[PDB]
Amino acid sequence: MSEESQAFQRQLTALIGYDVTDVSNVHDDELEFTRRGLVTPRMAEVASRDPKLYAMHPWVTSKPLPEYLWKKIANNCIFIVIHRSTTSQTIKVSPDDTPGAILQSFFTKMDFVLRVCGRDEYLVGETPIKNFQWVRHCLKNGEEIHVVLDTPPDPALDEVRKEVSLWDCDRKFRVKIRGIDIPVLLTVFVEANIQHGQQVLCQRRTSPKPFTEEVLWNVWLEFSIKIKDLPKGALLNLQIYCGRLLYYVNLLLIDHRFLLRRGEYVLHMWQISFNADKLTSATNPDKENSMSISILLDNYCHPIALPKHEMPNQLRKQLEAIIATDPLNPLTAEDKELLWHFRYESLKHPKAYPKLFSSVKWGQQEIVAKTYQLLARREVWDQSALDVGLTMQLLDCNFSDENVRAIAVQKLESLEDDDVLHYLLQLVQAVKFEPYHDSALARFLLKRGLRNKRIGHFLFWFLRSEIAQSRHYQQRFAVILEAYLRGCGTAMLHDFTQQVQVIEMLQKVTLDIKSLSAEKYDVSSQVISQLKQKLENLQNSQLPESFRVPYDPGLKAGALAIEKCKVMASKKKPLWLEFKCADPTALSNETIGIIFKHGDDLRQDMLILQILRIMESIWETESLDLCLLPYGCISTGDKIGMIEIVKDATTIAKIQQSTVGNTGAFKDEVLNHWLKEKSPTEEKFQAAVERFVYSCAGYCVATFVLGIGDRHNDNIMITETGNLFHIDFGNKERVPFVLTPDFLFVMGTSGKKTSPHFQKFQDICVKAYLALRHHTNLLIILFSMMLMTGMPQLTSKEDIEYIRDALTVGKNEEDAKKYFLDQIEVCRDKGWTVQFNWFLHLVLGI
Ligand SMILES: CC1(C)CC(=O)c2sc(N3CCOCC3)nc2C1
């Protein structure tokens, strides 16, 4: 423990935002055991990754070139403008070529690597040039592929620092509820529940006594279950109801060492303000204001859970009907008993696993043991093609068993980096449903991070996001981050530092300029100086030379641009900031637009934004583009965070506020005028018109399904290139989504007719809607996880099921294609009704 090793920990604690050495809010050594446990996966992956490739973090995909991309290349040859000092020449390179093929056969026509100008993206590795993500991004936006001919980054910069019984106890389980002690204030009773994967097994209560600062009981709660029957994962959930639920706390009956919990406990509970926070094994660190629960566990010696070593056609059809059901459709006892009985038969269908392992009676050891027998042989699931939507299901709050969950993590392993990045956020979030800190999932994330800088970059911010504002899961998440920062490399270790410094500094300002204004949502004149002033105050010798853009790790942001910085006219007062690109190779003077806001939980914007990236790739599988704009959004604090800025993009409302004004006399021709006027060449007007139809279709569908299509006119934007997109995702009038008359005007149907564009629109919709329905289960699980992992409010069964109706489950496919168009019609039959109401509701406060 050198003085040097004692400062490093002081450092990490800063890059994490929580000190993983604060045994002040723990009743055991699980976290510590976990840090000690992650030391191997970390080092193992660290001392196993190719230093060269890792240094350049190539970004590729094995997926086939989409229809629109493939069917767009000039026959079988493309062009990549190569750069150097100042010189540059264009080369004809086939799609199936490789970085090795080029550069080498190129070197002999006039020992070095190809890097994208302005970015930290090198095109290296033995992979088809077409397989490179960045390149696909070029073709997509129809752009040239310029790259500087420079030397490979020194792989030595990623250096890493110097690194007694069993089932022989048939006595019923009991717990002594000594009392509850609350510092400062009808009746109140304690409710102990033996839980397992949100599945309540046994439950007891205490005599309703008077609610005072201290309410004793010293009453033993005898359950009906048995010690031998307690499953590895069983959780002791303690709750307090009034004379409704008020305080809840949990305690894992079986610990990380497979040992039965025992002794005295004075756990500090959480107070209610269903979701993943009620599942936490952590205690409230606020020992001064939090309710306390004193309990006692029977005194013994040391019991330990040992680590275990043809049908009627009418029934077949009945089983099948159960297996081919959506994730949200429950199971009757008949169902479960049916599923169980036919274990092995239900084992031949991967799609049956979630439903199958939910029919298990985990409150019975003999059964659980049998279950472990079923997992002993699963060639079907093991050989079946990976199904994320299926894999994800086994990772939610419905499966507290590590053996079951570990089979999903096993499937995840198959996923290439590209895919890991698509689901990273939800996976990270899925750690909340893990009954123990050290878990197969936690490790997978760690490995995949230390394995790839990209994944590693994002893993950091996702994890950090939670640690900052989540008292319920910060610890576990903090220990998982520490394990990552200790193997990613001094290089990244330094990038993260630079990144954190900037952020923290900018948050200071963001919240500073916020106080200097209340109900006056009008940016004062003397406040414009306050901002410009403080900004330069940092440029002096504070703001690092050039941090890296969190939502875009490839981008290096240099010095600011105080001149172009301001404070949006929002009743919250965000911070519009522009940055110069630190990379002098970027063939553009164009700045970097980043926003900093407070008041809205950007964690929700994140989830919703990532789902959008999902829907875009989901369509790519069906060869379909919708031009969505899932701009970058990274959370960092409670109601703080940063956001990317789309260039040349205006509010749809503002485009109306121009031609019209401070009224609701919305005119249809407005929008269509904006495009043609903004886009000079008659050609660009034509193209901008197409983008809109596609972008509008894309967002119309996605927003509907997510249940966030009916939003004010202010929450929707558009670009001088026709691309449209939504924003700020953080007894009356309603609507599926937004398809206002000004929109349809650009399609060719001012009134209620049709056109060669509106039919294009409708056709694209269903072609997109039916595509997402193909992945009904995936979207249901994600949406379901997003709600209980991201949406604070105690998500109800009713809220989650909205996704079912939206995707029209059960209903035939034919009725679907029609169901959507019907929704479109609902919009036409409302013109500016819903919108006009939002104006009267918001702009007039009614
Ligand atoms: C304050 C505000 C409404 C909150 C929010 O979520 C977004 S998202 C956004 N976009 C991002 C893309 O570039 C244009 C602006 N502005 C804002 C501003």
SS3 letters across 642-677: EEECCCCEEEHHHHHHHHCCCCCCCCCHHHHHHHHH
Residue 454, SS3 per DSSP = helix
> Residue 572 — φ and ψ, nearest 5°?
-115, -20
The whole-angstrom separation of Cα 642 and Cα 503 is: 8
Q: Which among 727, 729, 842 is the best mutation to test ligand 1's pocket, defined by most ligand atoms within 8 Å of the CB?
A: 727
* Cβ neighbours for 654, distance < 8 A, ≥ 6 positions apart: none
600 marked among binding-site residues? yes
Please report, for residues 18, 93, 261, 303, 305, the alpha-carbon distance to residue 255 in angstroms, rounded to integers and kept in the order given: 24, 59, 7, 12, 10
Pairing relationship of beta strands 78-79 and 92-93 according to DSSP bridges: antiparallel
CB 591 within 8 A of CB 573: no
714 in contact with ligand 1, CB cutoff 6 A? no
Give the distance (Å) from ligand 1 centre to CA of residue 551. 14
Give the distance (Å) from ligand 1 centre to CA of residue 679. 23
How many Å from the N-terminal Cα to the C-terminal Cα in the chain? 64
Minimum CA distance residue for ligand 1 atom 9: 727
510 marked among binding-site residues? no
726 in contact with ligand 1, CB cutoff 6 A? no
The minimum-distance atom of ligand 1 relative to the CA of 631 is 12
Minimum CA distance residue for ligand 1 atom 15: 645
The whole-angstrom separation of Cα 19 and Cα 74 is: 56
Minimum CA distance residue for ligand 1 atom 12: 645
Give the distance (Å) from ligand 1 centre to CA of residue 653. 13
What is the enclosing helix (H) or strand (E) of 78? Answer: strand 78-79
Minimum CA distance residue for ligand 1 atom 5: 728
Q: Over the range 384-421, which residues count as b (16 or more CB within 10 Å of their CB) and which as e?
A: beebbbbbbbbbbbbbbbbbbbebbbbbbeebebbbbb
Pairing relationship of beta strands 187-196 and 199-205 according to DSSP bridges: antiparallel
Interhelix angle 652-659/669-678, nearest 10 degrees: 100
Residue 194, SS3 per DSSP = strand
643 in contact with ligand 1, CB cutoff 6 A? yes
641 in contact with ligand 1, CB cutoff 6 A? no
Give the distance (Å) from ligand 1 centre to CA of residue 727. 6
| Greatest alpha-carbon span in the chain | 90
Give the distance (Å) from ligand 1 centre to CA of residue 701. 21
What is the enclosing helix (H) or strand (E) of 148? Answer: strand 147-150
CB 577 within 8 A of CB 594: yes
651 in contact with ligand 1, CB cutoff 6 A? no
Query: Which regions of 540-672 does DSSP assign to beta strands (E)?
Result: 575-579, 592-598, 633-635, 640-644, 649-651
* Cβ neighbours for 526, distance < 8 A, ≥ 6 positions apart: none
The minimum-distance atom of ligand 1 relative to the CA of 714 is 3
| Two tokens, residue 518 | 């209340």
Give the distance (Å) from ligand 1 centre to CA of residue 714. 10
629 in contact with ligand 1, CB cutoff 6 A? no
The minimum-distance atom of ligand 1 relative to the CA of 570 is 1
Give the distance (Å) from ligand 1 centre to CA of residue 709. 17
Q: Considering just the CA atoms, what is the radius of gyration of the chain in Å?
A: 29
**Degrees to nearest 5, angle at CA 331 with 328 and 336:** 140
562 marked among binding-site residues? no
Q: How many CB atoms lie within 10 A of CB 685?
A: 16
The whole-angstrom separation of Cα 549 and Cα 592 is: 9
Residue 312, SS3 per DSSP = coil
Q: Can you list the pairs that 793-797 forms with residues at least 24 positions away whose Cβ atoms lie under 8 Å?
A: 793/275, 794/272, 794/274, 794/275, 795/274, 795/275, 796/274
DSSP lists the bridge partners of residue 248 as 239, 270
The whole-angstrom separation of Cα 220 and Cα 835 is: 60
630 marked among binding-site residues? yes
642 in contact with ligand 1, CB cutoff 6 A? no
608 marked among binding-site residues? no
Give the distance (Å) from ligand 1 centre to CA of residue 636. 16
650 in contact with ligand 1, CB cutoff 6 A? no
CB 535 within 8 A of CB 509: yes
CB 446 within 8 A of CB 41: yes
Q: What is the resolution of this structure in A?
A: 2.8
Give the distance (Å) from ligand 1 centre to CA of residue 725. 11
CA–centroid distance for 106 within its chain: 42
The whole-angstrom separation of Cα 777 and Cα 790 is: 19
CB 647 within 8 A of CB 590: yes
The whole-angstrom separation of Cα 236 and Cα 203 is: 10
567 in contact with ligand 1, CB cutoff 6 A? no
The minimum-distance atom of ligand 1 relative to the CA of 629 is 12
Q: Which among 517, 728, 729 is the best mutation to test ligand 1's pocket, defined by most ligand atoms within 8 Å of the CB?
A: 728
CB 461 within 8 A of CB 424: no
Q: After which residues is the chain broken (C to N over 2.5 A)?
A: 110, 163, 185, 243, 273, 309, 730
DSSP 254-305: B-TTSBBP-EEEEEE-EE----GGGG-----S-TTTS-EEEEEE---S--B-
Minimum CA distance residue for ligand 1 atom 7: 728
CB 501 within 8 A of CB 509: no
Q: Which among 513, 595, 640 is the best mutation to test ligand 1's pocket, defined by most ligand atoms within 8 Å of the CB?
A: 595
| Two tokens, residue 529 | 């100086």
What is the enclosing helix (H) or strand (E) of 314? Answer: helix 313-323
Residue 802, SS3 per DSSP = helix
Is residue 529 packed enough to be buried (19+ CB in 10 Å), middle (13-18) or exposed (0-12)? exposed
The whole-angstrom separation of Cα 599 and Cα 286 is: 24
Please report, for residues 168, 170, 231, 370, the alpha-carbon distance to residue 228 in angstroms, rounded to integers and kept in the order given: 7, 6, 8, 15
Closest listed residue to residue 641, CA positions, set 521, 532, 547, 551: 551
* Cβ neighbours for 471, distance < 8 A, ≥ 6 positions apart: 282, 284, 285, 286
256 in contact with ligand 1, CB cutoff 6 A? no
| Two tokens, residue 159 | 């250096």
725 marked among binding-site residues? yes
The minimum-distance atom of ligand 1 relative to the CA of 645 is 13
The whole-angstrom separation of Cα 400 and Cα 36 is: 23
The whole-angstrom separation of Cα 447 and Cα 483 is: 10
Please report, to the nearest 10 degrees, the dihedral formed by the alpha carbons of residues 347, 351, 355, 360 taken in order: 20
718 in contact with ligand 1, CB cutoff 6 A? no
Structural domains for the chain: 1-163 (3.10.20.90), 168-301 (2.60.40.150), 302-489 (1.25.40.70), 490-647 (3.30.1010.10), 648-836 (1.10.1070.11)
Pairing relationship of beta strands 575-579 and 270-271 according to DSSP bridges: unpaired
Minimum CA distance residue for ligand 1 atom 2: 728
The minimum-distance atom of ligand 1 relative to the CA of 725 is 12
The whole-angstrom separation of Cα 623 and Cα 616 is: 10
Please report, for residues 213, 242, 274, 292, the alpha-carbon distance to residue 269 in angstroms, rounded to integers and kept in the order given: 14, 15, 17, 6
Minimum CA distance residue for ligand 1 atom 17: 728
Residue 831, SS3 per DSSP = coil
773 in contact with ligand 1, CB cutoff 6 A? no
Q: How many CB atoms lie within 10 A of CB 427?
A: 24
636 marked among binding-site residues? yes
The whole-angstrom separation of Cα 202 and Cα 200 is: 6
Elucidation method: X-ray
Give the distance (Å) from ligand 1 centre to CA of residue 591. 17
527 in contact with ligand 1, CB cutoff 6 A? no
